[PDB]
Every structure is written in structure tokens, then in C-alpha cells.
Amino acid sequence: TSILDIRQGPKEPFRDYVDRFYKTLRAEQASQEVKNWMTETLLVQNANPDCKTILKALGPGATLEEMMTACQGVGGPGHKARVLAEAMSQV
């Protein structure tokens, strides 16, 4: 297992991916400074398109509590419907 191979599934809840991310990151042989830098880069890059789009609107300076509260709706009826509703207006 490698922290770089950790990617968020398309139907995986955000709370679990960050769980495996932090579950595996606590094992990667590196310094705490590197592990914090990993968090700043990987976590937002290896997320799925739906979650990444939500995070790009948050701007910088957000915390997990700010991310996860914004992503635990992804995969929910309001999200899936809103996404499916915006597409019909796009087409």
C-alpha cells in the first residue's frame, strides 16, 4: 500500500476515503512535515470530480470539518437530483 495510490471512489463517501487516507498516511514512512504537506496536496487532488468541484468553491484555508460538512451530501438525494437537474438545463 502507498499513500499515492489512495484515490476516492466514485460512489465512496468522503468520510471513508479520508479515513483510509489518514489510516494509510499514519503508516507511510515520512516526517510529520511531509505528511502534513501530503494532506495539502493529495487529499484535494485524488478526490472524485463531484467532491473536487465542491472543494474548489470553498477557496483556501478550509479544514476537514469544513470539507466533510460540505461533502457528506454528495451521493444524497438532494445532490444526485440537483446534479441531475442542472444537467437537464445544460441540455
Residue 48's identity, in one-letter code, is N
Based on the shown chain and the rule CB under 8 A, indicate whether residue 84 belongs to the binding site for a second copy.
yes
Q: Which stretch binds a second copy (CB under 8 A): 23-31, 33-41, 49-57?
A: 49-57
How many residues form the binding site for a second copy (CB under 8 A)?
A: 36
> Of these, 23, 30, 36, 53, which contacts a second copy (CB under 8 A)?
53
User: Which among 8-16, 25-33, 35-43, 55-63 is the span making contact with a second copy, rule CB under 8 A?
Assistant: 8-16
CB-based contacts of 6-14 (< 8 A; 24+ apart in sequence)? 6/42, 6/46, 7/46, 8/46, 8/47, 8/48, 8/51, 9/48, 10/48, 11/75, 12/48, 13/72, 13/74, 13/75, 14/47, 14/51, 14/67, 14/68, 14/71, 14/72, 14/74
Binding of residue 28 to a second copy (CB under 8 A): no
Q: Does 74 engage in binding with a second copy (CB under 8 A)?
A: yes
Candidates 49, 59, 60, 61: give the one binding a second copy (CB under 8 A).
Answer: 49
76 touching a second copy, by CB under 8 A: yes
